[PDB]
Design a protein around this ligand. Sequence first.
Ligand SMILES: *CC(=O)N1CC2(C1)CN(S(=O)(=O)c1ccc(I)cc1)CCO2
Ligand SMILES: *CC(=O)N1CC2(C1)CN(S(=O)(=O)c1ccc(I)cc1)CCO2
Ligand SMILES: [Cl-]
Ligand SMILES: [Cl-]
Ligand SMILES: [Mg+2]
Ligand SMILES: [Mg+2]
Ligand SMILES: [Mg+2]
Ligand SMILES: [Mg+2]
Ligand SMILES: [Mg+2]
Ligand SMILES: [Mg+2]
Lengths: 11, 11, 231, 231
Amino acid sequence: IRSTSTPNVHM
Amino acid sequence: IRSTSTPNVHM
Amino acid sequence: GAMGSMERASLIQKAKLAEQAERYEDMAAFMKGAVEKGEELSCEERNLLSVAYKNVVGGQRAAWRVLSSIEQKSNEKGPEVREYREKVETELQGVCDTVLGLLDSHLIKEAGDAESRVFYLKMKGDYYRYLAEVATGDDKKRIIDSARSAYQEAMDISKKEMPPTNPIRLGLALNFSVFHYEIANSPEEAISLAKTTFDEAMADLHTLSEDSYKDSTLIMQLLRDNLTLWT
Amino acid sequence: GAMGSMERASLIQKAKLAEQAERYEDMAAFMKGAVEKGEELSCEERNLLSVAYKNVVGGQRAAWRVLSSIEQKSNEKGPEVREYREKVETELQGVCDTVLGLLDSHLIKEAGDAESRVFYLKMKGDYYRYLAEVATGDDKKRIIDSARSAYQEAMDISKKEMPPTNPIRLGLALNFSVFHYEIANSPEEAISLAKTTFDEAMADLHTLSEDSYKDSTLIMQLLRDNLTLWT
Ligand SMILES: *CC(=O)N1CC2(C1)CN(S(=O)(=O)c1ccc(I)cc1)CCO2
Ligand SMILES: *CC(=O)N1CC2(C1)CN(S(=O)(=O)c1ccc(I)cc1)CCO2
Ligand SMILES: [Cl-]
Ligand SMILES: [Cl-]
Ligand SMILES: [Mg+2]
Ligand SMILES: [Mg+2]
Ligand SMILES: [Mg+2]
Ligand SMILES: [Mg+2]
Ligand SMILES: [Mg+2]
Ligand SMILES: [Mg+2]
């Protein structure tokens, strides 16, 4: 349902 | 490695 | 306390909402509020209390184990790892103190049904055991005795008043067996208790209850898994 | 504040330990402490700040959505659901206020490299967007404007100073597209931004950096997934 945003991925 | 104890299973 | 103005039934209701929202700190606070009303808890309410506090102390134990392992590997570079491990240790001890306080001030009674009496004494053993995982010195042996004593009293009541498939009885026996192996350096006592517990349940399998057999069958498998591990 | 006596380098060190221990509230507190030293953050430190706060506000958003859905279904039975949803809402707003405070008091500057300027303005948009998910009335339109404005300024800098595969540029564009679709009721603006962003990255794929291409390729797939969803 909800649009996906930038994930909390360690850079 | 660690022994398993009673789990946090909803009753 | 902060929950003093809220009705018992609303605290129970909010504990269930907090469980649904995976807000386990809130859930524990709501159930501490409910216990402080000074009425007895039902089976369903003991489940809410147990789940909430076990989740909170669970995250603290996992954190402490990560930090303790970094610290021991570093003892093979600054005070930061020790300081932060001590900070998490202090909070963990705080939560175990809160639980042991509630048990002693409100929940543990001479009266009540066997289920309630065994459950609370099992819970006293578990939270003394969690303190023992992080303890050292004069504080420690006091802690290990308090855990064994609470567990044994629980075991005495369970063997006299409950069928051998009863999920509180099985969970208590599982957790006492872990005390023996992980805390008390007594692998023999652990294996003996676990094997006796499994074998007696299977011998009297007909005693499974229609409302709890899935819980009993799960604990029986965990005793089997520990026996395989301890070989 | 509580971190005022601790050295900046020790706060960074403890933020990394807290990340390892999955103690994200501690990690956020450590990084707020580091920011309050008033030195600039590196790329690695912005990652620690971002991860810590996104985890904290993440759990609050998930909690709020669970509670809000129970509340709306109940509006189809006591004040308890509304009261508890309001309690979680207040804490969420508290954390977004803390982040927006740090950005405005310490991090957002006229000077600095493009990466830092775009990252902080993207972060301002995101935390205004999180306030907007729970806002209503005169407070709300103020919030939605503040989010769009922060995002647009970020977009202006990114298109001028960064290659079109840059992971901050791509993540900002992904998040502005979500603002358009989920907050601003502008599906057209969303689809247009997402498609332009994907197509321009693919057109200039040669601009991928050796140290960040896995992050760029991940965001490109998330823009594609949203386009599939918005069809
Ligand atoms: C009826 C009652 O008082 N209950 C307490 C319990 C049901 C069971 N415990 S427990 O720790 O004994 C336990 C046993 C089996 C399993 I699977 C999980 C937990 C806690 C929850 O409520
Ligand atoms: C170098 C720098 O300043 N950085 C900030 C960042 C690297 C990236 N952001 S982000 O929100 O732009 C982001 C982009 C791609 C992905 I996958 C995740 C997050 C946050 C972390 O550090
Ligand atoms: Cl610390
Ligand atoms: Cl509340
Ligand atoms: Mg009342
Ligand atoms: Mg100590
Ligand atoms: Mg043996
Ligand atoms: Mg210093
Ligand atoms: Mg409100
Ligand atoms: Mg369209």
